GROMACS .gro file of C-alpha atoms in nm:
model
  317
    1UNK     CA    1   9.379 -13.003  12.288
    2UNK     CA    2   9.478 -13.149  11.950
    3UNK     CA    3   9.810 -13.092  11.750
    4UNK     CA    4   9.734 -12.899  11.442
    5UNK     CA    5   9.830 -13.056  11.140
    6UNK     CA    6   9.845 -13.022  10.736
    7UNK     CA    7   9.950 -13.284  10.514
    8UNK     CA    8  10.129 -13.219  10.173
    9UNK     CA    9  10.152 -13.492   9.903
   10UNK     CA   10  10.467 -13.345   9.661
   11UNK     CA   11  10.668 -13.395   9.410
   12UNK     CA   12  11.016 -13.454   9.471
   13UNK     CA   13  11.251 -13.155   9.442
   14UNK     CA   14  11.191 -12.907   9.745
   15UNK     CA   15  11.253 -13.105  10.076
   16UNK     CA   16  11.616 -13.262   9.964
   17UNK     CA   17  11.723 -13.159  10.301
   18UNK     CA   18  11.764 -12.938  10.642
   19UNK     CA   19  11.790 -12.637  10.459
   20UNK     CA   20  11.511 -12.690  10.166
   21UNK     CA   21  11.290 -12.448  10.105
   22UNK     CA   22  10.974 -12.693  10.228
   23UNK     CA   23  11.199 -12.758  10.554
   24UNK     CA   24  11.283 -12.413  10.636
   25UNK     CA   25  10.932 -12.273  10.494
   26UNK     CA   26  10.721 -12.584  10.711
   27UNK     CA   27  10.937 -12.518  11.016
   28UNK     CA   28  10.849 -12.133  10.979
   29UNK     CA   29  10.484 -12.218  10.931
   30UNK     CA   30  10.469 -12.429  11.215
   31UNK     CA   31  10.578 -12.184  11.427
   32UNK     CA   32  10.388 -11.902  11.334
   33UNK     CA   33  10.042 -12.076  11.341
   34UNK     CA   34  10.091 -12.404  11.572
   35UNK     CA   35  10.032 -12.597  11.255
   36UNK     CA   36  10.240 -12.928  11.182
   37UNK     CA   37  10.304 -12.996  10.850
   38UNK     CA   38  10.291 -13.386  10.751
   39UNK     CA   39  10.487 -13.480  10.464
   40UNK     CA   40  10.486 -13.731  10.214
   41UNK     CA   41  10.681 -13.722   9.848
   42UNK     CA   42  10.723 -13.913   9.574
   43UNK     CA   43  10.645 -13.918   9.167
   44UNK     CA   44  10.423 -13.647   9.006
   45UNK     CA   45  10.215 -13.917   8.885
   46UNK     CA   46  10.238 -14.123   9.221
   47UNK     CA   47  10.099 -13.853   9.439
   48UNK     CA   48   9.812 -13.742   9.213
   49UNK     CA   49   9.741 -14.129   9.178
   50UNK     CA   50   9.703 -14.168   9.577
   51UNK     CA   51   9.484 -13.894   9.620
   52UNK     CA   52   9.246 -14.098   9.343
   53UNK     CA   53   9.328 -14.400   9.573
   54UNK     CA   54   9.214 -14.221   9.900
   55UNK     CA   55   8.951 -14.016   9.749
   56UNK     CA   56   8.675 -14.146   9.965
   57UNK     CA   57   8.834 -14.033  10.261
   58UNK     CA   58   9.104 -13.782  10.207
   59UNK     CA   59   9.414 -13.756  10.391
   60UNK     CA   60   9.616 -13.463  10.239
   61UNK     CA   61   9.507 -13.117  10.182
   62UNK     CA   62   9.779 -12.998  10.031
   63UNK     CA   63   9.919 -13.121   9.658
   64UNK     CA   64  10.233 -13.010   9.485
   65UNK     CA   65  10.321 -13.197   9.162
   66UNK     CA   66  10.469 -13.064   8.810
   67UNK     CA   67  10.228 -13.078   8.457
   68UNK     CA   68  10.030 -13.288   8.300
   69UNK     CA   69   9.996 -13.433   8.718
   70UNK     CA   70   9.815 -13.111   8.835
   71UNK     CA   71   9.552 -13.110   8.513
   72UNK     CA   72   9.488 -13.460   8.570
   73UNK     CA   73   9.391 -13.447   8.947
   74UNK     CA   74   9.198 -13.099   8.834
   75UNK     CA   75   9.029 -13.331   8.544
   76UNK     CA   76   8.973 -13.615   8.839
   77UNK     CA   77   8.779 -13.336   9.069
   78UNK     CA   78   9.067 -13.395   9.355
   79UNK     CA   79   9.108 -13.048   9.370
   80UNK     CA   80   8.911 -12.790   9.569
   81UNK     CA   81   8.810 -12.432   9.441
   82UNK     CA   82   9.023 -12.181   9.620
   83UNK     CA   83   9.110 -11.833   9.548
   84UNK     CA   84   9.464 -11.735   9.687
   85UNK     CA   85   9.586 -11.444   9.826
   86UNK     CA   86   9.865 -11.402   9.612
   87UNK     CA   87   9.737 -11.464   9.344
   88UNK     CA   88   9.710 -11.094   9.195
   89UNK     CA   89  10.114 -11.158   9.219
   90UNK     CA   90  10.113 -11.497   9.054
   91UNK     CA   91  10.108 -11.553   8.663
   92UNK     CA   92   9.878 -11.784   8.551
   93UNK     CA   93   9.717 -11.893   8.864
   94UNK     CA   94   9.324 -12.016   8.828
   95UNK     CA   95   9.082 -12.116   9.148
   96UNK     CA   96   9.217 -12.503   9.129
   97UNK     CA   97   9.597 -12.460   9.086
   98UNK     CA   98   9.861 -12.222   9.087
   99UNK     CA   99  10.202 -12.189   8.955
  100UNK     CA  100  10.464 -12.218   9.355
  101UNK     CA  101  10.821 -12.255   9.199
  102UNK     CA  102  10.952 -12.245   8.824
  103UNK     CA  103  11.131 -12.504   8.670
  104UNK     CA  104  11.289 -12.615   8.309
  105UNK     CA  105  11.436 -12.931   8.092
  106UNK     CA  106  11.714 -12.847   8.031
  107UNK     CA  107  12.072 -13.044   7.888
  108UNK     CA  108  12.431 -13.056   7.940
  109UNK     CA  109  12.746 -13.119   7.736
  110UNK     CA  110  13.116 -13.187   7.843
  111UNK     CA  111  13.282 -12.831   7.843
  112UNK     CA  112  13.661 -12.984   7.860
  113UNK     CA  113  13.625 -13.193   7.552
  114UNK     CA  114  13.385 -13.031   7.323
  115UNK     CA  115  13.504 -12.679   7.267
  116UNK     CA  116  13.155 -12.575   7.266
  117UNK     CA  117  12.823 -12.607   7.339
  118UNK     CA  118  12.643 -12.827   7.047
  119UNK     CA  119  12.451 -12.584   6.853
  120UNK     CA  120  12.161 -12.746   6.742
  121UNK     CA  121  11.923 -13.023   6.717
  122UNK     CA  122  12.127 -13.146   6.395
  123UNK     CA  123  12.435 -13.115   6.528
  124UNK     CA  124  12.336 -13.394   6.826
  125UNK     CA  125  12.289 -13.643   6.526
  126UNK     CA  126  12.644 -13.593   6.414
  127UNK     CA  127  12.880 -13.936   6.432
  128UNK     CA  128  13.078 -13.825   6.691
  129UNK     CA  129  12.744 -13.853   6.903
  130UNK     CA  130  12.785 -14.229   6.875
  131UNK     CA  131  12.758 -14.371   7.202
  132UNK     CA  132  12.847 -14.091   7.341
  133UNK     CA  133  12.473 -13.934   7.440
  134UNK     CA  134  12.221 -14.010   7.633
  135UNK     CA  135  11.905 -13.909   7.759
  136UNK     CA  136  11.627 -14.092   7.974
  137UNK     CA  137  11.386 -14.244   7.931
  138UNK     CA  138  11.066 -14.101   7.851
  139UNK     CA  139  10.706 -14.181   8.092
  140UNK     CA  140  10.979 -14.353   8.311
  141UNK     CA  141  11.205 -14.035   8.384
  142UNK     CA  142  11.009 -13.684   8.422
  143UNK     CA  143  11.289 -13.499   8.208
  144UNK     CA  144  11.289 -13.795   7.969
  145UNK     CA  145  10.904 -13.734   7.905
  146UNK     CA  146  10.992 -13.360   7.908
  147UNK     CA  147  11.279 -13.430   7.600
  148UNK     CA  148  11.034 -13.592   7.423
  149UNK     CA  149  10.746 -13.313   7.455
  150UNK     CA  150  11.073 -13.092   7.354
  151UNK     CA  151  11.127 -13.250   7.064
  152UNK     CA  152  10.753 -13.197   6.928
  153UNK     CA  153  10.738 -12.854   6.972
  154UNK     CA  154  11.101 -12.800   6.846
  155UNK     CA  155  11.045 -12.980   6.525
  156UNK     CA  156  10.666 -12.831   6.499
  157UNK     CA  157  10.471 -13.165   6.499
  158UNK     CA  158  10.462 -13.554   6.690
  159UNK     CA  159  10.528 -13.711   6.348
  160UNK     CA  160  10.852 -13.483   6.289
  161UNK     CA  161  10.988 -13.451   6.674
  162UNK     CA  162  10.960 -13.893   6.680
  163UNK     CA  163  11.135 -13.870   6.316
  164UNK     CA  164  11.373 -13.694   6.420
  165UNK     CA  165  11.434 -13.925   6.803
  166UNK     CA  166  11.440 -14.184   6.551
  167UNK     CA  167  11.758 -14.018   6.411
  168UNK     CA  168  11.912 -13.948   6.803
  169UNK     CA  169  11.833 -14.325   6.853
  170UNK     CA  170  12.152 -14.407   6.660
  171UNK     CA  171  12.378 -14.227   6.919
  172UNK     CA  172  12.159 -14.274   7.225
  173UNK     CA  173  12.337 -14.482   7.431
  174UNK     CA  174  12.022 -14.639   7.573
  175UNK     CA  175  11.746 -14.587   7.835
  176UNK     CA  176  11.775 -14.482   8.171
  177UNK     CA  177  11.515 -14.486   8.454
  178UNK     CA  178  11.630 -14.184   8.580
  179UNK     CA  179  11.800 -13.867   8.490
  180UNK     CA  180  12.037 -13.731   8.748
  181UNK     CA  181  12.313 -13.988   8.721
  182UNK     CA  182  12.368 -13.870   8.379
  183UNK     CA  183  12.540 -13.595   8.493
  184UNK     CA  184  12.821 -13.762   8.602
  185UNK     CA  185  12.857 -13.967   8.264
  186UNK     CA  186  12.862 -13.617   8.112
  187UNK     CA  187  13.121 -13.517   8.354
  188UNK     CA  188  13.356 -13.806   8.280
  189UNK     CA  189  13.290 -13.786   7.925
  190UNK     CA  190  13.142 -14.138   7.931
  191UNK     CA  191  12.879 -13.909   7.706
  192UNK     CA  192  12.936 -13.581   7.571
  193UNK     CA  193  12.572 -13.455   7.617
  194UNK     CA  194  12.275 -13.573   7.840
  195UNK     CA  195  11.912 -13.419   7.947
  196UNK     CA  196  11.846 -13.276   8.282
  197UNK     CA  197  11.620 -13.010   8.425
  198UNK     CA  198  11.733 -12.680   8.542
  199UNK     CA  199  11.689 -12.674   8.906
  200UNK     CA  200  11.907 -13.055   8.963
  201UNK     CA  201  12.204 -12.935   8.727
  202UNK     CA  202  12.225 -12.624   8.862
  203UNK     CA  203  12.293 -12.758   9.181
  204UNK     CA  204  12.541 -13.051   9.032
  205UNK     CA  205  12.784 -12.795   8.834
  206UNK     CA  206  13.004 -12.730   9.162
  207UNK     CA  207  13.113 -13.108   9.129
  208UNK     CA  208  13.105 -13.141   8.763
  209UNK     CA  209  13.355 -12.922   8.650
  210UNK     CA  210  13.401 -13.022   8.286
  211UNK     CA  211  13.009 -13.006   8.187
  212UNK     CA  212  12.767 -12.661   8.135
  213UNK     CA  213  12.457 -12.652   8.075
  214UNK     CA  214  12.316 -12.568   7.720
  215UNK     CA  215  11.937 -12.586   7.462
  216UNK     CA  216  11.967 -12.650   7.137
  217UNK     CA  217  11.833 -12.466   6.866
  218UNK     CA  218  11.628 -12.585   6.570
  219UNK     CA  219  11.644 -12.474   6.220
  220UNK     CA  220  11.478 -12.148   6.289
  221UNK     CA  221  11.762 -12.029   6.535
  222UNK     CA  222  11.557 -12.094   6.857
  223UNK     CA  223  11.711 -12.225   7.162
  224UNK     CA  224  11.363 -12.269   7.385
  225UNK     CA  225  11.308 -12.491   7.716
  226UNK     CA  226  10.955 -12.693   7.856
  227UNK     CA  227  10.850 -12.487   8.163
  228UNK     CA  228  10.789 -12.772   8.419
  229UNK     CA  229  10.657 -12.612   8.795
  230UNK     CA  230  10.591 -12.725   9.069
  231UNK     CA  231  10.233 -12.696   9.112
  232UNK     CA  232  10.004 -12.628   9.416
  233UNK     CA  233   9.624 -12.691   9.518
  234UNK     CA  234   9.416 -12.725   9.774
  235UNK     CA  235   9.266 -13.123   9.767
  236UNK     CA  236   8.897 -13.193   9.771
  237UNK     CA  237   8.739 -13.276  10.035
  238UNK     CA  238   9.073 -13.271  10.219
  239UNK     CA  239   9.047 -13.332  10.660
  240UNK     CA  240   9.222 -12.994  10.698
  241UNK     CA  241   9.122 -12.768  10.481
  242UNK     CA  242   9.176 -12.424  10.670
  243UNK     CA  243   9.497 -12.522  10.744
  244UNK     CA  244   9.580 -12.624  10.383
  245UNK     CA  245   9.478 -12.288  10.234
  246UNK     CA  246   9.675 -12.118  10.527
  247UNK     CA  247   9.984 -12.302  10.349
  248UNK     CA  248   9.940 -12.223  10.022
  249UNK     CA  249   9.875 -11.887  10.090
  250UNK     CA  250  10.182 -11.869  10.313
  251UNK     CA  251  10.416 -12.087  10.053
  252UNK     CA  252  10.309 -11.816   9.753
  253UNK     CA  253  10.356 -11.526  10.003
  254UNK     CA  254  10.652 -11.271   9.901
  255UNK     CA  255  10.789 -11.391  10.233
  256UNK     CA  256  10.876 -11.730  10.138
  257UNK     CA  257  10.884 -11.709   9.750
  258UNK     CA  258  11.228 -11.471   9.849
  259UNK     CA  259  11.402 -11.734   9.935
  260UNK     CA  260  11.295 -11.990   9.711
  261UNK     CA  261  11.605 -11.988   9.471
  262UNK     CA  262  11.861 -11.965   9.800
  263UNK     CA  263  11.741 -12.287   9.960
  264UNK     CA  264  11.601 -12.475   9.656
  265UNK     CA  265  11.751 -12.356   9.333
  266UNK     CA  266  11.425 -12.329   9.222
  267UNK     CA  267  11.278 -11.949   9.032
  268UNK     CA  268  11.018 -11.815   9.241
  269UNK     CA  269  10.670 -11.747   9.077
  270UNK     CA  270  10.571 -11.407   9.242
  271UNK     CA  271  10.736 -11.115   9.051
  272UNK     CA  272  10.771 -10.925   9.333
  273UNK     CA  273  11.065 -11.066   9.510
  274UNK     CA  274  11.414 -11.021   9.427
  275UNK     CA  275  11.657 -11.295   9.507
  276UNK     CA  276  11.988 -11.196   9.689
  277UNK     CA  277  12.173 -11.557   9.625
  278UNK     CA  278  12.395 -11.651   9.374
  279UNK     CA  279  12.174 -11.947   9.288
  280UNK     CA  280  11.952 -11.741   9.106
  281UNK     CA  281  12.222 -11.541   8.889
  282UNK     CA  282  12.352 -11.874   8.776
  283UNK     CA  283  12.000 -11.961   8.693
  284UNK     CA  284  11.977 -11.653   8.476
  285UNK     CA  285  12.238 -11.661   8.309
  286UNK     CA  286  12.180 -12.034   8.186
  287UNK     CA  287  11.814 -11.875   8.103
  288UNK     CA  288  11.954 -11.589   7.873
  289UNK     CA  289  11.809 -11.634   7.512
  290UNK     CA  290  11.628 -11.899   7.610
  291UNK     CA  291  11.241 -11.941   7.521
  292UNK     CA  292  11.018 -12.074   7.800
  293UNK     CA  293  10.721 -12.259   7.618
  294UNK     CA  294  10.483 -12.508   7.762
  295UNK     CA  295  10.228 -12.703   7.555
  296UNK     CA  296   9.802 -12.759   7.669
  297UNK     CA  297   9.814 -12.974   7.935
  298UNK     CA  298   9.516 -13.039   8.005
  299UNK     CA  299   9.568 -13.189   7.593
  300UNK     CA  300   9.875 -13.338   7.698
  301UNK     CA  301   9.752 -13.521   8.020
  302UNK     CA  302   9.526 -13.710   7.792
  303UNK     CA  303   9.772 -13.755   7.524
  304UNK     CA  304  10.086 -13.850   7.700
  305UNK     CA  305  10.068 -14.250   7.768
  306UNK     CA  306   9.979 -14.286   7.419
  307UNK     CA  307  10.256 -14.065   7.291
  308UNK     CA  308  10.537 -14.270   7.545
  309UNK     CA  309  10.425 -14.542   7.396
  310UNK     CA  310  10.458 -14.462   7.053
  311UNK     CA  311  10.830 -14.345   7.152
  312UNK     CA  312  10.883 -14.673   7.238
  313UNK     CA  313  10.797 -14.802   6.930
  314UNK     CA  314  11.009 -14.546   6.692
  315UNK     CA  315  11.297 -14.628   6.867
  316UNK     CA  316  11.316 -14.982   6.980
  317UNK     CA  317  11.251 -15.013   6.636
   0.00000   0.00000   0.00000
């Protein structure tokens, strides 16, 4: 006999722990079809970088990362064609990709000392920002890079979004590789207001009592927030390609998209299912007002190492 396997390549975010949504959903797979599911995590960029590296002789069939890292392995042909199931259910999913759990950016502010939430872009520039902000840094933290992204679209153009980090350069405290220890900074009031993404912060309010979560708006009154999945296809030429679509098709079924926000704190994709956790009302109600956009990625995947570079330049300088 052999042990069945599939192997999934991810993004961080879904298996932090026993009760994750890839633990519980894996563990439920398994069961149902004899099929063990090999794991390995890391960077969107470092997954979608090791399938280039092992191209010749694949060893996942399953990839999970969050944009521009799913356009650039569809650009790079390591993704197989594949129609889903689902996907009548499932917004925006093509034959190479498909949308598996929604995410934001988002930021937070200190609750106990600023009465309340800053109200706009300008506002962040304001004195009393001095030292006391901070967001990460972009290429080397994903909700840095998604911050920076932010600020194009808010400000409707690169040369105006980089003017205008220029500006938040003389409050930013500094860079940071990563973005989740912010929180506490926020929490202490070390800073007043930091980046984040929707899905971590939600799950750090319980033990950061004085900090929310908040957008800012831009002169034209609109609060809106980068939509940033996690991302699924099937890999090219993968050793276990059967079992890999069985996965997806079982990771976008209603079945395990229900309890996507319980487990993960993630928004499911399918619009079918209707969470029963509190997760997802606190999720909502952070969302309320708030305008999802997301750029061209496929644009942006060729675009972004240029563009973090330039951010280096505005503001080092």
């Amino acid at each position: 006999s052999m042990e069945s396997v599939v192997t999934v390549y991810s993004i961080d975010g879904l298996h932090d722990g026993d009760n994750s949504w890839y633990q519980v959903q894996f563990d439920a797979f398994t069961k149902a079809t004899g099929i063990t599911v090999r794991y390995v995590e890391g960077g969107g960029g470092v997954v979608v970088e090791r399938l280039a590296k092992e191209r010749t002789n694949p060893q996942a069939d399953v990839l999970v990362t969050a944009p521009p890292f799913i356009q650039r392995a569809a650009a790079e042909k390591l993704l197989a064609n594949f129609n889903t199931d689902t996907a009548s259910a499932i917004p925006d999913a093509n034959n190479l990709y498909s949308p598996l759990v929604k995410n934001y950016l988002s930021f937070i502010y200190n609750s106990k000392l600023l009465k309340t939430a800053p109200a706009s872009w300008q506002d962040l520039l304001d004195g009393k920002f001095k030292n006391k902000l901070q967001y990460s840094t972009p290429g080397q933290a994903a909700d840095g890079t998604a911050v920076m992204l932010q600020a194009f679209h808010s400000f409707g153009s690169k040369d105006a979004g980089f003017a205008y980090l220029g500006k938040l350069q003389a409050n930013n405290v500094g860079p940071s590789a990563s973005t989740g220890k912010l929180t506490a900074l926020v929490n202490k009031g070390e800073i007043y207001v930091a980046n984040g993404d929707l899905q971590m912060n939600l799950a750090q309010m319980e033990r950061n009592p004085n900090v929310k979560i908040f957008w800012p708006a831009n002169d034209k009154g609109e609060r809106s927030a980068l939509a940033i999945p996690y991302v699924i296809g099937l890999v090219q030429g993968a050793p276990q390609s059967e079992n890999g679509k069985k996965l997806i098709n079982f990771l976008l079924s209603k079945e395990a998209q229900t309890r996507v926000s319980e487990l993960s704190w993630g928004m499911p994709v399918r619009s079918d299912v209707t969470p029963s956790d509190e997760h997802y009302k606190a999720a909502t109600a952070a969302l309320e007002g708030v305008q999802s956009w997301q750029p061209n990625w496929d644009d942006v995947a060729v675009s972004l190492s240029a563009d973090i570079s330039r951010w280096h330049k505005v503001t080092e300088s």
